[PDB]
Write a protein that binds this ligand. Structure first.
Ligand SMILES: CC[C@]1(O)C[C@@H]2CN(CCc3c([nH]c4ccccc34)[C@@](C(=O)OC)(c3cc4c(cc3OC)N(C)[C@H]3[C@@](O)(C(=O)OC)[C@H](OC(C)=O)[C@]5(CC)C=CCN6CC[C@]43[C@@H]65)C2)C1
Ligand SMILES: Nc1nc2c(ncn2[C@@H]2O[C@H](COP(=O)(O)OP(=O)(O)OP(=O)(O)O)[C@@H](O)[C@H]2O)c(=O)[nH]1
Ligand SMILES: Nc1nc2c(ncn2[C@@H]2O[C@H](COP(=O)(O)OP(=O)(O)OP(=O)(O)O)[C@@H](O)[C@H]2O)c(=O)[nH]1
Ligand SMILES: Nc1nc2c(ncn2[C@@H]2O[C@H](COP(=O)(O)OP(=O)(O)O)[C@@H](O)[C@H]2O)c(=O)[nH]1
Ligand SMILES: Nc1nc2c(ncn2[C@@H]2O[C@H](COP(=O)(O)OP(=O)(O)O)[C@@H](O)[C@H]2O)c(=O)[nH]1
Ligand SMILES: [Mg+2]
Ligand SMILES: [Mg+2]
Lengths: 432, 132, 432, 432, 433
């Protein structure tokens, strides 16, 4: 595993993914033309991981922008950086999913599916090495949840020996776009649990709650929620972009993070939490940002870390800080909190220290955790699903698109199976 | 007492005489064979060679069979290695093939689960597509 | 005459290999290409038609950048191209990947280059394999390389240099899995095995060399000193500088019991201690002090089956003989009933050579200990517990099974360790 | 019975044979070119026994130098006496025995055995009337103990009507730290008892015990101890080597020394004992000369002469004094201690007086005794063997070479049989 | 005519041969080539050649060459006829079975077809004079074989031997008593008479008479030669007593088994201790009965006598000899057996005592030799038998003999002969039927 092809899906996915490319570029030092402008030599550290070596001094990003609506396909190019992406990979859709999973995964998706699954074998075949493919998609709408999972299933069928990484920005009723969201999510979670090697669970409720309460924005905008969302993506992809030698590969991450196939949903945690395009900051030192892994107020997935047990943890430290103290204080959050870390997986918490920090943040901490507490997120979605499904409400939007009632029953069943699996290893003890 | 002289013989280069001091105290009766024979001496020598040339030849018996035993133990040193190296390749080639038909079987089992989805995405438009 | 092939496999194998060749060339005075104008060193380094010193070693890693770092770095072109073998994708810290998956593609190629250096030997003794325990290649590939060499070379010698996994230094959660899996498949193969615990060495370059955060450069600089001490006897000829194969006999009484315990003294940093000199007696008792040893365990609570003492430079027999008498009297070192014997002594003419741009200080006299002790089982016991902890719930097992591995292969590997622990437990007993 | 063929085996055997040759050539008067330089004409008519009549005014020694290692084959010729030996009599292999008997007697020995069997063929065919064969070999190593006994067995098979004389410099734990020595010795003693007509038992514990006390030196090497063995060898080498008629034949010695076939191991005794550096000068008297060679302190085999009974004794005097007081002391030392001479063998102690004498110091005496006390030496080796063997330690080094467990049991059994045989005649009385 | 063949076997036989023949050259005047300066009886030991030289009628045999090569390189090389000296390659290594059964077997036929040719030059040969050691391999092995073959090849021809009894004081092997007993047992019936010479007895009359502390075989044999060249008195030169070798069995040997006389010689003179008065009879006649001047370690003060032969060399008149006998007969510890009388067959030879010019023994005007068959000779056999029984009890060195093809029973049979012979010498001392 050596080079990653990025895919953007739907309104959310295309916006979060663009804002990711917007923040990832200024870290490495790439201008909106494609060319490099960075200070040192340690930024273009085998850039062939996210950026494709273009016809000259240029470095075009290896991203495939996909959406069933032209609305998001005439927005980011007029905005910041957007001009950078290759023209051909902009796979447009004139029709639309209309926040319906069945339309996105079956009807409208089928026409554009084979079209997008020809623009990547003209990107991955041009890759002298290949890690896999990472997808930025929402689980609430129609294009991200529907079509996104369809590409996931199609490329897994075509490329079985690669890692399927995902940025699953799942729905919340606190920031909902549609009533049908629990149907869309459950149907895609069922697809995710079976077809992805690893997934970053980006809970909209968590983003909203850190915006509304911690950041204290009376009316949180998508941009505000996406700002923290991108800041989390930079922090996570850090290893996959710099010479850290600590699960810096897509496979090495999975083998260090997933102990059981179905339990591959990661609860991301970022610190410090910053207000979009502002913050002068007071700056948090090594001890001040270590313990913020147990504080749920720093979780990007609305699940209390102390409610469950950490199966595997990947801690990333961005910025200049003595690594000697960084591990020392990272050690104290174990010997004083041993209850929340599974005894049966020795040295399960792994630390990484880099030189490249995020946007305005001089020093940051990013906790990729595989906590059994994520069951709370799926419980919420299942509870939201069983509410409408007990009423067998809005089902005619899906059944009319060709779908079956049983197709929902398995998607639901397989999800409550996953919750019980997460509870299974939470209640599990190393005997003695 | 008397010293009786008999006077033995007389010659040009020396003479001799017998002297009897006291008379002899006594006068009385005591006062398969075929010895030696060549055929018996050459028989005892032939038989001596018969056992001498046997002992040394019988010494070679304990030395020659022990020498061809060192030959079988050094032969064993290689044939035990050859029957180990055969077993080493026998296990490896079987185990390498075992892992081949193990992973190539799950790959087909994988592309059955995510192949039956295409059958479901064929039954959907069959359940859909209505102008009525 | 009496040639020795050094095979370096994986990130540890390659990096500890390049760190010692740096010292091996300094032990003679060889330049970075082969320049040494006006022996006994020709056993470890061959000679070409041009009049230069060509290496009789081979570096292999399924990942390129590690081997690329030496083919571009300081000690460049002392080697030809053929022997620095590389693949594209690593074994992603998975045994089955390095043994069955990626390793299979490179096995015949290494076992094609393997004789086109063995054929250049008038009469080789055997091999020196350098590998990690927790690494994908260091475990997987080494095992396959060792297995295949036993068919390709037969009864020929194999002396491995295993790198025991430490939690503090950068690792993977699956390291005990790779550790147990590799040893089990390398017991019938490998005539001798020198283990080096990263924790035990990390401790001394922090407690004796005062470096709070030591990098692999500092770590390997110490490993090189012990490997250079273990070797030397075949690379030089003193008054009575005993051959390693001659005392391999003294160390390995039973085929499975081939794990000696490495110890080194004195361990002093370049800064301060210009005075005191260091007495002949002090270093000899330091060998029995559990602080200065390469493997973490208590020889005080264990039986001694062998004791090989190797000395360097400024050492006289009368002072050495008296120093041995002081350990026999003043100390209660439980020697086993079946061998007395006692200690196998060996004095080397060469002074203790150090890296000029390194951290260790130049001393007049140096001592190395080999000793086969029951106490080594305590290191296996740590590994087996960690394995049984993860295996109980089958954590990360799916990663191995996925590469074609059988679930029974794990239980069989643990059964070998369960038998080997009993084997080390049995050899202490003492007859009636 | 007028010609002899000398054979050197292994490091020890060659580093003793060459030292015996450099002392005996100097004893007669032959310079390192081959030519004669001696004073008188009396010591001349006896060189034909050990030296060949060469193509001119020169004499080449009848010696066959054999070793599986080239180390001893590139040492003595560069030193003093070495080029004197015939070039084609230097039959040496490249891959050594490695202090292993099974390797020397079976594996590596077999390839060079028939090769040396052709050199001995040529030298004995060029002999008018061959006496026998004398071998200088150690019983500790692999070449001497292993290959040496293999030649002994092979020669005995080819030349059954010649005497097999041996200088068996057997091992001690006081001088050598090699562990396998009791195995090597026992295995070769079993070969010696069956295949040699007569053997001089050179116990290295005895010449080690000849260190400092009243022996002059605290720090030995080998040569200093080899000084004594060459003096003991040259001490014996004055019977069938000089015009004196005593035991002036190899067979006449055996018929006067061995009363029972298996009891053919002689305890050599030499006096006055001189250090290699220091000199006694104008000292030592005839009654003091007689007194020395009958006590433990002068024995070359570590066995108390008063701990057993002398079966047969051969006393040799190198001193131009009156043979009256030389024998007057002989028939007075035995009347005082008649207990240590078997009554059943009348006049068992025989004296010899030669008219040279040595050059270093006018007084010299050598004793050849067949004491039942030699059982103590074999007991020691058997005790050393049964220590390692009772649990089957280091046996894989032998079993792996093709050898069997029973092969050891017979070698051991046959040796304890010999000790009981020596005790049998020790407890034997001329009563009934 | 008469004649005498001298067979020398072994190292002792040969070295004692080149001692007799030297004192057989200076008596006559026969210079090292064979030429004579010139009675009529010297031809019994020397044969006239076509060229003119006098070749001695003898044969030297040894399984080892250097000992006979010593004579072949010596001044008397041209004396003995070039092919006369027979040699083998390897010796009998002080083993009877080696010299008798193995290495001797290869040379046996060659020696008796050689004696054959020198015996054909005799016009009525008397018999043989065999010279051998008791302790060597050859001499006590080959001699025995040679003797049993001379009895088949020559029949009823009288052959006398000169045995060299083993002494611990000179050279010697541990197995000497084994070789001693084995040879006598097999050579007893094939020998008409046997003159034993104990090396100890002659070694204990050189320091105490010739004044020589550590003597060599040259000094030892120089004395032996004088007694052998006193035993051959009338054989070498036309006398009256012992004129033929059959005239040794008649006067001495009373029974076939009892054939061991005791040799004695006087005067024992040196050339160092100034110049003393020429002491004749009644001074040297009593010296014959003094056990000091004897060749065998024996004490005839207890042993019952059989016969005597007082042999003289020099100018001695019968009148003073019978006056010397009268002085010695008066009160002495000597007694004869009942049946055999006190009859000394005294003989005188006019010839002067001849000595080696380059030797150590001095020239005397008169010399005396005494042949006496005494019971006391058994305590020289008793010495040997004890040493044999001591070694044979535990079978020491027996494997060396058995190895050369010998039977273990051959030892017990040899001891049984000595056990019978000891009884034979013992049973003689009884009165009388
Ligand atoms: C190669 C033969 C030799 O003559 C014998 C020793 C070795 N060499 C070189 C000199 C030497 C010695 N030791 C060395 C160590 C390293 C380098 C060189 C030496 C040597 C010596 O000091 O010369 C004065 C010596 C060696 C020993 C030695 C004495 C000695 O001085 C002569 N010991 C007798 C043995 C020894 O094994 C033993 O059995 O004594 C109890 C002993 O074991 C102990 C202490 O228990 C000891 C040291 C005393 C320790 C460990 C094992 N070795 C093996 C032999 C033994 C020693 C002498 C020369
Ligand atoms: N002492 C030392 N230890 C090392 C070195 N490199 C890695 N390690 C340790 O060995 C283990 C990691 O094994 P690696 O060698 O890095 O992995 P690998 O052999 O390359 O196999 P793959 O990367 O999965 O293909 C951990 O205990 C590391 O801390 C090194 O250079 N020196
Ligand atoms: N008087 C005398 N005794 C001798 C002489 N040579 C040897 N002896 C003695 O006779 C015995 C030795 O017998 P040897 O004649 O030397 O041996 P050999 O007859 O040659 O038989 P081999 O040498 O075994 O073949 C010992 O008692 C010697 O001391 C000699 O020349 N004169
Ligand atoms: N953080 C974030 N969440 C979004 C955004 N857009 C939509 N969502 C959430 O995801 C769901 C709508 O998915 P969306 O991608 O917009 O529709 P699609 O175009 O058919 O895939 C609802 O749950 C929204 O709350 C966005 O821009 N940012
Ligand atoms: N006295 C003496 N002993 C030696 C010498 N060399 C080796 N030894 C001893 O003999 C044994 C080793 O035999 P060695 O000849 O060296 O091994 P080989 O070449 O395989 O026969 C050990 O017990 C050593 O102590 C030597 O030169 N002199
Ligand atoms: Mg690696
Ligand atoms: Mg002789």
């Amino acid at each position: 595993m050596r080079e990653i092809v990025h895919i953007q899906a739907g309104q959310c996915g295309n916006q979060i993914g663009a804002k990711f490319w917007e923040v990832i570029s200024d870290e490495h030092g790439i201008d909106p033309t494609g060319s490099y402008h960075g200070d040192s030599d340690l930024q273009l550290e085998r850039i062939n991981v996210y950026y494709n070596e273009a016809t000259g001094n240029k470095y075009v990003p290896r991203a495939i922008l996909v959406d069933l609506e032209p609305g998001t396909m005439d927005s980011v190019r007029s905005g910041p950086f957007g001009q950078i992406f290759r023209p051909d990979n902009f796979v447009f859709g004139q029709s639309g999913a209309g926040n319906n999973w069945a339309k996105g995964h079956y009807t409208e998706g089928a026409e554009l599916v084979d079209s997008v699954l020809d623009v990547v074998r003209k990107e991955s075949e041009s890759c002298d090495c290949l890690q896999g493919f990472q997808l930025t998609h929402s689980l609430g709408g129609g294009t991200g949840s529907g079509m996104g999972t369809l590409l996931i299933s199609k490329i897994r069928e075509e490329y079985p020996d690669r890692i399927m990484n995902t940025f699953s920005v799942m729905p919340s009723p606190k920031v909902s776009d549609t009533v049908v969201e629990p149907y869309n999510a459950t149907l895609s979670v069922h697809q995710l649990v079976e077809n992805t090697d690893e997934t970053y669970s980006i809970d909209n409720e968590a983003l909203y709650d850190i915006c509304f309460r911690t950041l204290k924005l009376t009316t949180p905008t998508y941009g505000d929620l996406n700002h923290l969302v991108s800041a989390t993506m930079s922090g996570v992809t850090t290893c996959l972009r710099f010479p850290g030698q600590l699960n810096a590969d897509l496979r090495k991450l999975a083998v260090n993070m997933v102990p059981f196939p179905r339990l591959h949903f990661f609860m991301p945690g970022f610190a410090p939490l910053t207000s979009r395009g502002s913050q002068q900051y007071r700056a948090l030192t090594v001890p001040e940002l270590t313990q913020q892994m147990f504080d749920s107020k720093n979780m990007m997935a609305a699940c209390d870390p102390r409610h469950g047990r950490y199966l595997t943890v990947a801690t990333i430290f961005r910025g200049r800080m003595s690594m000697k103290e960084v591990d020392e204080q990272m050690l104290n959050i174990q010997n004083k909190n041993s209850s929340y870390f599974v005894e049966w997986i020795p040295n399960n918490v792994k630390t990484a220290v880099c030189d490249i920090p995020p946007r305005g943040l001089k020093m940051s901490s990013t906790f990729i955790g595989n906590s059994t507490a994520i069951q709370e997120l799926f419980k919420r979605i299942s509870e939201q699903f069983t509410a409408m499904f007990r009423r067998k409400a809005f089902l005619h939007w899906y059944t009319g698109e060709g779908m079956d009632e049983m197709e929902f029953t398995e998607a639901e069943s397989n999800m409550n199976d996953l919750v019980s699996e997460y509870q299974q290893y939470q209640d599990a003890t190393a005997d003695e | 007492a008397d010293m009786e002289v008999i006077e033995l013989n007389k010659a040009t280069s020396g003479q001799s005489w017998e002297v009897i001091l006291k008379p002899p105290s006594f006068d009385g009766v005591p006062e398969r064979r075929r010895d030696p024979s060549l055929e018996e001496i050459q028989k005892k020598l032939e038989a001596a060679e018969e056992r001498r040339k046997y002992q040394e030849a019988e010494l070679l018996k304990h030395l020659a069979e022990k020498r061809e035993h060192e030959r079988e133990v050094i032969q064993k040193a290689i044939e035990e290695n050859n029957n180990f190296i055969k077993m080493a390749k026998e296990k490896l080639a079987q185990k390498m093939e075992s892992n081949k038909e193990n992973r190539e079987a799950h790959l087909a089992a994988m592309l059955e689960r995510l192949q039956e989805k295409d059958k479901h995405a064929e039954e959907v438009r069959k359940n859909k597509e209505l102008k009525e | 005459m009496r040639e020795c092939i050094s095979i370096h496999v994986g990130q540890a194998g390659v990096q500890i290999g390049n760190a010692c060749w740096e010292l091996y060339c300094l032990e003679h005075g060889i330049q970075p290409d082969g320049q040494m104008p006006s022996d006994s060193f020709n056993t470890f380094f061959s000679e070409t038609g041009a009049g230069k010193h060509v290496p009789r070693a081979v570096f292999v890693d399924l990942e390129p950048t590690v081997i690329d770092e030496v083919r571009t770095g300081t000690y460049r072109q002392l080697f030809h191209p053929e022997q620095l073998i590389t693949g594209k994708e690593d074994a992603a810290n998975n045994y089955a990947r390095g043994h069955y998956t990626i390793g299979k593609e490179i096995i015949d190629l290494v076992l094609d280059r393997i004789r086109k250096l063995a054929d250049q030997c008038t009469g080789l003794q055997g091999f020196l394999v350098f590998h990690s325990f927790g690494g994908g290649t260091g475990s997987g590939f080494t095992s396959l390389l060792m297995e295949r060499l036993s068919v390709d070379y037969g009864k020929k010698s194999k002396l491995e240099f295993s790198i025991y996994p430490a939690p503090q230094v950068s690792t993977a959660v699956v390291e005990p899995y790779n550790s147990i899996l590799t040893t089990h498949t390398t017991l019938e193969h490998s005539d001798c095995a020198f283990m080096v615990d990263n924790e035990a060495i990390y401790d001394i370059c922090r407690r004796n060399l005062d470096i709070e955060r030591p990098t692999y450069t500092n770590l390997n600089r110490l490993i090189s000193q012990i490997v250079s001490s273990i070797t030397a006897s075949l690379r030089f000829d003193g008054a009575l500088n005993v051959d390693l194969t001659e005392f391999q006999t003294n160390l390995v009484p039973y085929p499975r019991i081939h794990f000696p315990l490495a110890t080194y003294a004195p361990v002093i940093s370049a800064e301060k201690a210009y005075h005191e000199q260091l007495s002949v007696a002090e270093i000899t008792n330091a060998c029995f002090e559990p602080a200065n040893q390469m493997v973490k365990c208590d020889p005080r609570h264990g039986k001694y089956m062998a004791c090989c003492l190797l000395y360097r430079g400024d050492v006289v027999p009368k002072d050495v003989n008296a120093a041995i008498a002081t350990i026999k009297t003043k100390r209660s070192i439980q020697f086993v009933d079946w061998c007395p014997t006692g200690f196998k002594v060996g004095i080397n003419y060469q002074p203790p050579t150090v890296v000029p741009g390194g951290d260790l200080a130049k001393v007049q006299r140096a001592v190395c200990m080999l000793s086969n002790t029951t106490a080594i089982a305590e290191a296996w016991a740590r590994l087996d517990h960690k394995f049984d902890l993860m295996y109980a719930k089958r954590a990360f097992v799916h990663w191995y099974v996925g590469e074609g591995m059988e679930e029974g292969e794990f239980s069989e590997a643990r059964e070998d360790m369960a038998a080997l622990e009993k084997d080390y437990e049995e050899v202490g007993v003492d007859s009636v």
